[PDB]
Symmetry: C2
Subunit: 80 residues, 2 copies
C-alpha cells in the first residue's frame, strides 16, 4: 500500500488513516484534503485511499490554522 499524498511506502496500516472506509462517500478527511490540494480524492483511485499520519498531521495542523484565519477574516469583513 502507499500514502495517497506522499506516495511513500505504507509500513502496515497503523501509521495510516483510511481516507475512505467501506460503503464510503463522505469522509471528512477527503473534505479537508480537497480544500488544500489541486487533485481530487475519490472512493476508487488506482492510487490509494490511505494517508500516512505524517502527511495527515501536516494537513490537519494547517487546516486548523486555516480555519482560525477564515474566522478572523469573516469577523473583520462583517464588522464596522
Amino acid at each position: 500500500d502507499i500514502c495517497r499524498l506522499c506516495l511513500r511506502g505504507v509500513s502496515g496500516a497503523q501509521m495510516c488513516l483510511q481516507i475512505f472506509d467501506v460503503d464510503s462517500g463522505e469522509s471528512k478527511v477527503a473534505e479537508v484534503l480537497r480544500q488544500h490540494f489541486w487533485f481530487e480524492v475519490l472512493p476508487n483511485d488506482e492510487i490509494s485511499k490511505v494517508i500516512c499520519n505524517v502527511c495527515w498531521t501536516q494537513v490537519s495542523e494547517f487546516h486548523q490554522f486555516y480555519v482560525s484565519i477564515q474566522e478572523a477574516q469573516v469577523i473583520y469583513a462583517t464588522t464596522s
Copy 2:
C-alpha cells in the same frame, strides 16, 4: 499595525515579515499566501501588508510540505 492573516496586534514589527516593501509588486510571500488562501494579497490593502512570524511559520511549513507533495504526484503521474 495588524497581521494581515490573523488580524492580531503587531507588537512592533520585528515579529513580522513585510509582505511587500516599498516600490513593491512581486513578493514571494504574497505568492505563497495566494496559493493557499481564498482572498487576495495586494500592495494597497486597507488591512495590512505585514504577517506575523507565527502565521508565516505555519504557512511556510505547510507550503514546503505542499511542494513535496506536488513533486511526488508529478513523478507518479509521469511514470509508467
